Design a protein around this ligand. Sequence first.
Ligand code: 3AT
Ligand code: 3AT
Ligand code: 3AT
Ligand code: CA
Ligand code: CA
Ligand code: CA
Ligand code: CA
Ligand code: CA
Ligand code: CA
Ligand code: YB
Ligand code: YB
Ligand code: YB
Lengths: 465, 503, 485, 143, 143, 143
Amino acid sequence: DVLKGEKALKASGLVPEHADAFKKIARELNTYILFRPVNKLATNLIKSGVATKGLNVHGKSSDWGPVAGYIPFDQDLSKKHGQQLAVEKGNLENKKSITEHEGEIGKIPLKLDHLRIEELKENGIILKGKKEIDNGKKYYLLESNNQVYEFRISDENNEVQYKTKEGKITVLGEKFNWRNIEVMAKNVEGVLKPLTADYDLFALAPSLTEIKKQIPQKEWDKVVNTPNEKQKGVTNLLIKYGIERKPDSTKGTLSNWQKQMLDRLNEAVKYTGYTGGDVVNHGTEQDNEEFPEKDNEIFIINPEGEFILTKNWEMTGRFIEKNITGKDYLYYFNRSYNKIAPGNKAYIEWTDPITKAKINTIPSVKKIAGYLSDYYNSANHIFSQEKKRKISIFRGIQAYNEIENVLKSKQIAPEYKNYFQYLKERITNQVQLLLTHQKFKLLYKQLNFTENETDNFEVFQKIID
Amino acid sequence: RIDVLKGEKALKASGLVPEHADAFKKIARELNTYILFRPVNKLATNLIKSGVATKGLNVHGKSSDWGPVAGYIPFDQDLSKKHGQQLAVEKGNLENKKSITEHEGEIGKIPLKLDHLRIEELKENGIILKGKKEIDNGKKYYLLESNNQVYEFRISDENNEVQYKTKEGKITVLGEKFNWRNIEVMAKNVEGVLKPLTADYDLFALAPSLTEIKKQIPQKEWDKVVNTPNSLEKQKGVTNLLIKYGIERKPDSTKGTLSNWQKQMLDRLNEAVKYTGYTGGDVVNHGTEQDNEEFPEKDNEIFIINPEGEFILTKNWEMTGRFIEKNITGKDYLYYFNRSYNKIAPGNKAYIEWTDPITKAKINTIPTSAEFIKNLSSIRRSSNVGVYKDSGDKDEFAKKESVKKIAGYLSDYYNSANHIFSQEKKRKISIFRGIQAYNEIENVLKSKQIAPEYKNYFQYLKERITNQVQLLLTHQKFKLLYKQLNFTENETDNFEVFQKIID
Amino acid sequence: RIDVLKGEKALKASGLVPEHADAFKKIARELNTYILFRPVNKLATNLIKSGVATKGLNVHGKSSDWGPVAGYIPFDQDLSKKHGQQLAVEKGNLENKKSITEHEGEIGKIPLKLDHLRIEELKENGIILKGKKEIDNGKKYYLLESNNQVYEFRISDENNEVQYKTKEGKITVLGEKFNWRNIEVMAKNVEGVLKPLTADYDLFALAPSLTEIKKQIPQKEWDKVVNTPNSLEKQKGVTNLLIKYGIERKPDSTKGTLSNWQKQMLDRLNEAVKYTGYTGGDVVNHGTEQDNEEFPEKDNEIFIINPEGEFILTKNWEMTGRFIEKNITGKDYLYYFNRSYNKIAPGNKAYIEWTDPITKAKINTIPTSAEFIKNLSSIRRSSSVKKIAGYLSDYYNSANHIFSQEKKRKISIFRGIQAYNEIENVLKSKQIAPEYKNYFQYLKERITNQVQLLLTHQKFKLLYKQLNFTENETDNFEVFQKIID
Amino acid sequence: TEEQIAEFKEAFSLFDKDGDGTITTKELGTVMRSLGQNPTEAELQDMINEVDADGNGTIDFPEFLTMMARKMKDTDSEEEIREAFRVFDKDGNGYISAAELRHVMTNLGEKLTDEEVDEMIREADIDGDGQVNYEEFVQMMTA
Amino acid sequence: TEEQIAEFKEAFSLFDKDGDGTITTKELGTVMRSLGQNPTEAELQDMINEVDADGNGTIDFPEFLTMMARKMKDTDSEEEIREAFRVFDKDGNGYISAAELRHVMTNLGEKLTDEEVDEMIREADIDGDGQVNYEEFVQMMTA
Amino acid sequence: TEEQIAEFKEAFSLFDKDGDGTITTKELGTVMRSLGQNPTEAELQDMINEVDADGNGTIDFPEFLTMMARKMKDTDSEEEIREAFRVFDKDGNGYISAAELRHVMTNLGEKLTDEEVDEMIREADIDGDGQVNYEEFVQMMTA
Ligand SMILES: Nc1ncnc2c1ncn2[C@@H]1O[C@H](COP(=O)(O)OP(=O)(O)OP(=O)(O)O)C[C@H]1O
Ligand SMILES: Nc1ncnc2c1ncn2[C@@H]1O[C@H](COP(=O)(O)OP(=O)(O)OP(=O)(O)O)C[C@H]1O
Ligand SMILES: Nc1ncnc2c1ncn2[C@@H]1O[C@H](COP(=O)(O)OP(=O)(O)OP(=O)(O)O)C[C@H]1O
Ligand SMILES: [Ca+2]
Ligand SMILES: [Ca+2]
Ligand SMILES: [Ca+2]
Ligand SMILES: [Ca+2]
Ligand SMILES: [Ca+2]
Ligand SMILES: [Ca+2]
Ligand SMILES: [Yb+3]
Ligand SMILES: [Yb+3]
Ligand SMILES: [Yb+3]
């Protein structure tokens, strides 16, 4: 239950022409292109060629009021209007961008041209009207269904200003008469150009066939051409030109292959007439382990040049497993998932197989010492496939009571026990599949452990028969 | 008379399960000990009675007191009773997240299910109202209405799973909005199956009778202490035992920080409710609130069960203190209040005040060579630090009149060697000893006010000093008897003056 | 010409007690020095006039500007102006909490006592109104109303003690909810008794005239400097005298960070008020805002008392900036603006902008050596030719004081292009962290503007082609001279 | 760092007959094979000869820590391996199949015979369950 | 702590006219005790030659910290004792009287006579007020 | 600040054909010189002879980073100087002119001739443009 065609687009925020231009890349490179939501009020700005913010500007874009579509200096004018702490954190980020990146990033007054006003009139964002006259200047009050801020725009230069309605106090303990709406801008050939929202890639799914291409034909043969230890070849080969990512300088953590894919995306938009420059500046969300973003909708462009939109996280996961992670395509998910993200402390859950099927094991007076915890013995590659599941089951039952039935030893608290007891349950199925593959309480009595393993080793080896 | 609730009325406000309360009257009466409980989420009582597992210190998420999840520990803490509070809800979720991860396997989260009965209890409690039938993508749910204005709710007919979403136009304190999603609750791993958690019975404190802690002492060491010569050894020996089996407590792996008799009182309480039927496990999972020094909790109403088996319930902090002062700390019962009280709790930065008799008398009490040299340490934090010698800029001086002689003359006030003398002897020698450390300070206030108000500290010592001096004097028959003494000569020429003045 | 308030109208906006401002005039005139105050809680002015003590730095609790406690520093910081801001209130209470503890005995808290007179003042001030009586536990209490719907206040009849509680339903910012409890106010100890506290006049700045600073300089150190053969050692020793007796500030134990002449100023100011009858002690308790580097306060209305004893009140931060420039800073008056301006304040993380002339010229001047490195370190936050750090160290070679302007220019124009080259090649390790590409690409422009400026002063891409690629030789400097001629 | 060290203070105790946490080069290769490693007899002294200019035979924990210090360098690339495994497992069951590995292979340009594949799986296979799980798969690169 | 450790180093400069903060073993006791301790002439000579053996026998801050960081580990009982005092003080005046002592004693099983009780009080009583205040109670319970 | 050291570090990475960063006293100056510092060639002797008398003459880092911790304790007037510069520059054009220099000197009590201030400005002018900018003012004030 997703969305497709022009409909999925009308909700992706992406600019059609660019969207369209992306199909070509999706097919050609035969890979999936997934994007996060893109500020809708900023979609037209991108089309008009406004610059998009890179990782040097963490400020929050706005989706209401005049500043709609830009990165307000005053974060309380961003999508985070209200949310006292949200506003602040943003503000600090702007300040950092403005100071830590002097000359690169800056802030300029907001000038809504003639066309833009019209657009915001359609989106029912603001409504120009009543003329004003104060310090001998001509201003037009820009109307907004907001109750906290009262705006207006110069007629002499088209600058937008904003204060606070009658004794109406704002979030961060403030209040102020006609000010000026500053916006995050980057330096473009000496002049400061205002910024907008970029196109953030949720993830990129490249067909393994393509990941091969990425690999150097000569270096691949080195281990692929019947050297036969061959699997380890194609893997440690697939890892580099496929998995391994690395921190960049402007794009967060990205992979070589991805950088290329990136450039294609940007180049693609140019052919459309986009002057602003790049519109895809950083790595995929899947590498954003610091501050994971869980978005309800993810615009997806399949290698068939089609448009698909997810409606909820749970849904995106299915699509990714049904068409990507389970369809020969190279994929991986944000390592922070199913864990507490170090930055924003986000706990984003994602189906992870290595757990789904987690019913296995792994890390005088002789009991602590000896072979009682090495179930995984590499020297099992020679032992016939039968003796495998045969000696295996034993290695398991071997640990059934390694030093396990020490449960009621004394007072051994809730996890340890509930775990060794659970671990027990695991070994149970792990050994079950073995027996059940081709055959416990079906007949565990025939398994009496009192004598050393080397003793029953013979008894058991025949018990199953 | 202290305006505290009694019997049923106090019980109802207590939040404890009535049966559980009664079942406690036994331990209170029997073990002659006062039992004090902190408030218990009223919406949890029926969950506890019904045998819902209680949460331990491994789960800090806050309980809810509204909506379909009332009484439970909601993963999304905005559904907790902390709803709306952007910061609380945050500390909430993050705490719930560590519980799921750090103690993985032991604590998890499951979907909320409101059985037929619970939904009924909630309607009566006037919490939620079973709404109309709704059909969504095949499944059939009944809406669950609540005067909430940020969340819409509904329950499944198939499995009874309750769901919630943001209302149209509304936003979440965390700045979120989303469509129908199961409401998750904090569960513990009970025999491999995850069972939902609810509120426990957090003890505010326990006041056992002194005679009761006596039994805590092995009838041997009590002997090796009573059967001895020196009374100064008998009394000192007894006191130290009291501390051992009554006052001392240590941090436990799970119970937090309780004493031994406390761990027993717990085992007792838990077992008592087990008898009544409680099938959830323990109902009291950790030590008293008096050992919660990092994040103290100031509760207006404290439920109390006295050793007479009666039920009490203070209305406000001040009242609790009074009750505890008249019936416990003033009637031969072991008691000690939270150490962070009157201080700034390290964690929650709470500043909870509490009457400390000691302090009440610190006024008319001479400081100690330590309770001095230490004050001259912190009063050194509000100034830099380099060389005590030559405190100024002028290198033509590097000392102060009566510098350290003050501390010395202080400990000389508290000399154990005074037991060989008589009261009258001690009084006199002490009164004089008081005027000694006084003069030495009096003088230090006559050179240079060097530091802004170190002089404020010395105008203070002299304040206390005087009170003590006057105190001892008022036991026989200050400034008036101070101008009769001269301290420009020497120790061997002044003492031989005061000795007569007294009479 | 800047739209600013003046006289009476400016006074009423200062929050300062009239007689006190009137007293300050004399002082500003007497020591030809501009005295600029930050805003003063209006609802504190009477309190102050009344004789209520003001607060020092040992009390960071914010003052209230509403409710029956208006003017005082409530223990419960939610009753203060910082009402609502869950964090400011939390930090307020924390500060108030520390003040009670960390300064046990000197700073305490006490029940608010709204006497008969304050009630009237609050009525006229449109803050609260005494309402319908009400007995409780055998005691009389008149409900004090206010446009606040979170709390409800009441006052006793025996001790005029005010009490508050949460209004049913509403929840305190911190999430509390209680009933009738006393309103506690921060207080200091006075001869043994705890006395309530109110706001203190906070100086935004003290700009004395250079002539006023000289007096600070001992008539010896100055003479020694003035009378020196060397011209440079003199000039320097002259600036040091200025710094040491004028600019230099030091941390005091209770007055915050302020200079010694500023300390004198404070005393003068407090001595001034005490003479007009004020009895609460000091009314000015700490250095100027320009030293509040940790928690800078960007106020819109600064009250100014210029050397003529006149009253002025700027309307906005920019206007305040103009006034300082056209009447103080570029007019023979010692002045220094908060060092945290144009940067992110450490404590409150504030970014208050201010016009620094030095940056205006950064564009044309070329970086020194330490400026090259201190931009390779601070630049190494978001992440082998040391010849550049050297060349720059040559351009600013303090040995050029023997050469002539004609000469200096010549060698500076060279030493400069030397860098514009050792920097042009660095831009040739293919690339390197593109965040460094712009630094040099900017530094190049910074060197271009500099040389091309030293040229229009005598005779850039052209004169560059007169390249001296020559690997290692001074012959470069030779063909150089030949180009100009 | 914690997780970066607690990985030793949790195993350097189950195998040590010394009430002071001081073992010997004896179990040196025993603890390591219990921590995930699998060094050969050859690889034991050859390393405890340089950094260990002492050679007393009795090694405690302080020496044990400093040892596996820079050891977990490139060999700590388990992350990419784990993500690699999820690439093979198409059905996300937790194990790799023949049709899977074969599929993955027949997609990387290396057409494998319906015979060779089954050979590979069995190579790293330990349980004989006709599959390979992470616990096993990891062994493939740990060696 | 920032205060606990800021007191020893603080009282250190109370009687050390030498600059190099090198107090003598003679003025040591006058310091190690001028503060919350009353050790015997033994420790003054028992540890003065252990951590202090540079010839003369002088003492500096780092050395003082060593000594203080020793028999100042169990002295933490200060808390418990304090609480204990509060137990005897029934009326809560801040002083233990000859009649409350009888209570705590008898209730703890140890029945005593007015003669005996009144004796213990006087024993702990130092200023002769006729009762025991915290300060007194502390010494008598520790020293 | 931590940046301070981060800066001094940048110095080494520049000229250090040693690797680990152990430049001797033969290039020590080549560090502070191009890093805002003009200490006497003499003080470089006794200092690099006291904290660095190991008999190797190799200045790693602490021997530098730490030794450095001294000058920036008194002459750290870097702030005041920048403050003073703004005082002279009345018009606020970033440079100190003869005229401006006059006013400051005049107002401080020292009357000068339009010939002198120009002598003073010229003596302070390094790039020979007739005006003194912050950099030059620092040179003039630091050196
Ligand atoms: N590949 C990545 N590597 C590191 N961090 C990343 C990566 N992708 C995203 N992030 C982190 O996520 C943050 C969100 O991106 P940002 O550009 O600020 O948002 P946005 O998608 O433009 O949203 P607005 O429209 O501005 O709200 C930026 C960065 O801290
Ligand atoms: N005896 C104790 N020792 C240490 N910490 C304690 C003790 N008693 C309480 N605490 C601290 O106080 C915290 C409050 O308990 P908690 O279980 O979170 O509350 P609760 O009483 O269940 O309240 P909710 O109904 O969940 O709001 C838990 C723990 O960090
Ligand atoms: N000279 C200074 N040195 C150090 N800190 C300073 C200085 N001047 C101001 N501050 C800082 O700014 C803080 C603001 O002063 P404070 O006394 O709290 O405000 P106030 O002006 O009385 O405002 P309210 O009336 O309480 O709102 C106090 C102190 O941390
Ligand atoms: Ca599979
Ligand atoms: Ca297998
Ligand atoms: Ca008493
Ligand atoms: Ca006494
Ligand atoms: Ca100028
Ligand atoms: Ca110049
Ligand atoms: Yb982005
Ligand atoms: Yb609890
Ligand atoms: Yb102030």
